[PDB]
Structures are given as structure tokens and as C-alpha cells.
Write a protein that binds this ligand. Structure first.
Ligand code: GNP
Ligand code: GNP
Ligand code: MG
Ligand code: MG
Lengths: 133, 166, 133, 166
């Protein structure tokens, strides 16, 4: 769940299908670091001189194998200066289920980099999206 | 992912919307609400490839016939639908085949012939006659039921296959 | 607010910039009928054999000058067999404000066909979108 | 609406993200969070035309230099940004101009020269030297402040104008 040498080979395979500065890197005892992209699709309430303005962004982040969904969510809300209650937001993986592409909410305790490594580099296979409830 | 522009055509009431909605929403529309022109975006996985399907669900009613040139220009593949309990709808198929061929200026535009409402017992279009027409055009024939979901994925997925092999 | 002959000329101008079967039609005392498109962008909770599936659709509707936002919302929820509380949904016009394209919530008492006529046929100028709160 | 692929390039710390975020979110980012590569979609109205801007905000840090060929291939116009209090950033501009020209195989790729941080008093790049460089390339020069919002719209809108007149 899995072997460290399993992780080593998985990283090497991953990196062959990715650019060098965007690859994963093995660290101590089967930990690793690497990149994900999160698509933010949010509606932002705005005031004129009611109304909303879209925030439609894909943020690329360098994270580790121990970085949690909770950390990814808070970091994005802070980076994009979103002031709403963080518990009103969820991170979803967009994945294949039953010939259908579905969005599955991630546990706040999940590890996005692990999911990314297992899925491989292709965002068609797994993409992350941040949504407000 | 790669994107595919699918257009669903055929006489009024054959089940074009019902088929589309079965694919999009996974349920059967019992109501009969004639379409003017509706469009859908659906992400799918077909033979391991993730595809974005842009699906145009068109009007079978004659009053909207003027809209055809426009959607035939833009469409990449066509599901040509008749209902197996409606002989006139089957007779109308060739008219769609011909207008697409004219508008796109091609005799091998990706198309699938769909005999819908195959859940119904009171059949008036023999499967052999429909198989014969599809063979004439060099296209696949599939029977579907928007009600039971029979053949629905195969119809759309076959069409995407027809496009990517074109 | 406006003249009936004003509406007559507005309809004629509208129709010159639109296909014939998609034009507006003048009726009794400055009423009229015509078409709008509504973009539904909804996330639909689904169960496997949590998760959501997108409903991303543009529905074209034939309506009249007296058709309300409330009527448009209910009709779409029923057409797309959306069972949620109708008061959890709103219709927005996507319009130009301050060089920015913003979404403005419509009053349930507003008349979309009137807005459509005033804006002209171009959906770049005004588009309608149905969203869940 | 028509879509425009804009790319924001320049040395690390010049304010590429701050400029982008001022356009996207209408606020100033005080924090310095080095970019790997971020993308944005923004609908705007420029001279009466509704446009979808796809904006790629790129890395100024050298560690991500390998990503440049990829984004230079796909970009339609480039905002080439330096900071008016950083002489080295201004020296780095020509390197971007040259790599874009190489990758796109053209000597008239739509570009705007942007001298950012014009809110700051301690200027080290004379405006005349920047005007001279832009004149050499045949492109517009605009001073911006992501902080005050000065010139921000003009920079992006000028770039779109450069693209649609190309
Ligand atoms: N039993 C059965 N009924 C079906 C099937 N497909 C559609 N119908 C029914 O046939 C009627 C018309 O279907 P609809 O999808 O609206 O047809 P359409 O081709 O889209 N009509 P239009 O061209 O006017 O838009 C509905 O009452 C619908 O439930 C099917 O596979 N089986
Ligand atoms: N005074 C002032 N500070 C600015 C301006 N633009 C950016 N800054 C500041 O300069 C710092 C770096 O800005 P940033 O936008 O991150 O630069 P960057 O070009 O995107 N960096 P990187 O290339 O590493 O992604 C921040 O602390 C930011 O607030 C400006 O117009 N005026
Ligand atoms: Mg229909
Ligand atoms: Mg940056």
C-alpha cells in the first residue's frame, strides 16, 4: 500500500510521461514531492459603484505526499483571497466511473499527490476541481 | 481531451430528445416537448479515451427546417433516428442523409442509423428494411430504446468511433 | 416604456439580425412572442451501484413578453427533472458592466423576452444562465 | 465570442501574477508566491467586442525555463513585463522577445512591453530606454502598476488589439 521500491518505479514511469521540472521526486521512506493542478470554478459576489463575477483558474502547486486535501483547500482560498468559510468548499477528483466522467468529493484527510501519482500525468484520467457547496 | 460535435436528426417524435437525455441525465423522458434546438456538453470515456461530446438535439417539426443548413455545416457526425413503429419516420431518413451530403459536400459523413423505440411490440418498420438502408449508405444500424436504455451508449459511442476512424 | 410602434420597429430590427423561424412576433397591445436560450450549469448529486454529475445544457424556449423569470425557472427544473427546491435556483443575465462581463440575478418577476428584445439577438451582449445557490 | 490566448512573460518578481490577478480579481496581491504556471479564463468587452481571454501566467524563475517552448507555441500574444526598479529585469526582456521569435518563427508576434511597478518612486530603468526598446521591436510600451491598477486594462486590451490587427 505500496512498497517504497514500488513508489520509486512509479515515480520513474510518471516522470517519463512528464517534463523534467514538472516531475515527481522521491524522498525519505517512500515520501515524495511533485505537482498538481487545481481548477477553481467559483462565483464571486461583487458590488458595483445581486451580481457575481466568475473566478475560473487553474493553479499549479508543488506539494508533498503528506499534503492533505484540507491544506490544498485552505492554501487556494488564501492565495485567491477568498474570505468565505473554508468549510463551504470541497476538492473533487474528476474521474472515470462506468463510462461516465463523475466528480467525487475528496476527504479532507486525503492526499492529492498520492492520487496524482497513481493516476499518472494525464489530467484526462484525473483532474482536481475546487467548488463551493 | 478531444471534442466531438454530434448532431441528432430525424422526424418529429422519434425520440431524439429522449435518446439524448438518456445519455446526458440517465433517465427516460415520458413527456413529449417538441424541440426547437437544444445543445449539451457531456464528458465520456470511449474505448479508454476521454472525449467531450457537444451534442446538438435538433427539431423534427417542419417549422424549424430552415435551421438545418446551419447545424449540418457545424456537425461532425449525425445520428439519424427513426422510430420502428412509424413508417413515415423511416421514409424521412433518406431526406436527412441527402441534405447532410449536400451541405457538407461529402458522400461519407460519419452517420449511424438508429431505429428507436425498440422496447415497443407494435413494430411497423421491419429490421431487415432498416439494415438494408444502412448497408446502402455504408453506415452502422443500431436499434435503441430511450426508455429501457437499450443501445443508447452503443449508438453514440459507435458514432464517435465513426468520426475518429474518418 | 416603450411605445407599441416602438416595440413593432424593435421587433423588425431584431428579426433582420435573426433567422425567420427564430424571430419575434408582435401580438395584441404591444405584447409579443419569441425565443430565448437558457444555459443550465448544474451539478447533480448521483449514486453509484459524495459524487456529482454535471448538467451542462442550453435549452431554447419559445415564450411571451408576459412570461416571468419564475415561470422560466420552474419550467426548466421540470423539463430537466430536477427535484430540488425551486427557490434554491436563480436565473442570471450575463451582461456588460464596466468593461467586465458580470452575472446579475434576475427578479422572479422580471420578463426575459423583454430583456432579450432590448439586448438584440446577440448572446455575447446578453445570455441567460440558470444556477443553483 | 472570439477567444484570445495571452501569455504573460518576464523575469521573476516583476509582477506578472500581480498584473494578471488585478485583471482577473480586481485586487492587488502583496504576497510573493513564485509561479510555476497558472491559467485563467476571463470574459471581457474590448471596444464593443466581447472576448474570452485565456491568460497564461508563466514562471520567471529559471528552474521552469524548460516550459517555455510549450507556452510560446500555443500563445497568440505576449505581455513582456519588467519592473522599472529592476535593471536586470529590463535586460532580460530581449531574451523573451528572441525566444518567442524563434519558437513561433516570426518577427511580428503580437507583443506589448510593460514597465510595471510604476507606483514606486525608486526608479532605475529610465522610461526613455524602455520606449527605445519598444520602438526597436515595433511594439507599444505601457507603464502599469498592479498595485494602483494604473495601465493594467490598457496593457491587456492593447495586446488584444495587437492580436486582432495582426
Ligand atoms: N416507448 C418509447 N417511447 C419513446 C422512446 N423514445 C422516445 N419516446 C417517446 O416518444 C415521445 C417523443 O419523444 P421525443 O424525444 O420528444 O422526440 P423528438 O424526436 O425529440 N421530437 P421533436 O423532433 O419534436 O423534438 C415522448 O412521449 C417519448 O417519451 C423509446 O425509445 N421508447
Ligand atoms: N509596488 C508594487 N509591487 C508590485 C507590483 N506588481 C507586483 N508587485 C509586488 O512584487 C512582488 C512579486 O510579484 P509577483 O506578481 O509575484 O511577480 P511574478 O512576476 O509573478 N513572479 P514569478 O515570476 O516568480 O511568478 C509581490 O510582492 C508583489 O506584491 C506593482 O505594480 N507595484
Ligand atoms: Mg426533441
Ligand atoms: Mg508569478
Amino acid at each position: 500500500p505500496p512498497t517504497i521500491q514500488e513508489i520509486k518505479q512509479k515515480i520513474d514511469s510518471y516522470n517519463s510521461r512528464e517534463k523534467h521540472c514538472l516531475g515527481m521526486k522521491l524522498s525519505e521512506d517512500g515520501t515524495y514531492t511533485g505537482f498538481i493542478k487545481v481548477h477553481l470554478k467559483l462565483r464571486r459576489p461583487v458590488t458595483v459603484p445581486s451580481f457575481y463575477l466568475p473566478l475560473d483558474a487553474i493553479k499549479q502547486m508543488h506539494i508533498s505526499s503528506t499534503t492533505t486535501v484540507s491544506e490544498v483547500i485552505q492554501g487556494l482560498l488564501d492565495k485567491f483571497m477568498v474570505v468565505d468559510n473554508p468549510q463551504k468548499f470541497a476538492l473533487f477528483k474528476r474521474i472515470h466511473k462506468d463510462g461516465q466522467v463523475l466528480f467525487q468529493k475528496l476527504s479532507i484527510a486525503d492526499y492529492p499527490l498520492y492520487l496524482r501519482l497513481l493516476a499518472g500525468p494525464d489530467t484526462d484520467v484525473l483532474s482536481f476541481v475546487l467548488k463551493e457547496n | 481531451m478531444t471534442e466531438y460535435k454530434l448532431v441528432v436528426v430525424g422526424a418529429g417524435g422519434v425520440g431524439k430528445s429522449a435518446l439524448t437525455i438518456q445519455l446526458i441525465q440517465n433517465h427516460f423522458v415520458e413527456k413529449y416537448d417538441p424541440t426547437i434546438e437544444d445543445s449539451y456538453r457531456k464528458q465520456v470515456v470511449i474505448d479508454g479515451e476521454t472525449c467531450l461530446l457537444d451534442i446538438l438535439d435538433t427539431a423534427g417539426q417542419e417549422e424549424y427546417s430552415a435551421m438545418r443548413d446551419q447545424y449540418m455545416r457545424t456537425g461532425e457526425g449525425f445520428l439519424c433516428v427513426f422510430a420502428i413503429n412509424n413508417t413515415k419516420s423511416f421514409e424521412d431518413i433518406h431526406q436527412y442523409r441527402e441534405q447532410i451530403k449536400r451541405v457538407k459536400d461529402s458522400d461519407d459523413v460519419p452517420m449511424v442509423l438508429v431505429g428507436n423505440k425498440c422496447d415497443l411490440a407494435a413494430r411497423t418498420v421491419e429490421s431487415r428494411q432498416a439494415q438494408d438502408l444502412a448497408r446502402s449508405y455504408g453506415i452502422p444500424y443500431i436499434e435503441t430504446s430511450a426508455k429501457t436504455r437499450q443501445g443508447v451508449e452503443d449508438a453514440f459511442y459507435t458514432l464517435v468511433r465513426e468520426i475518429r476512424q474518418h
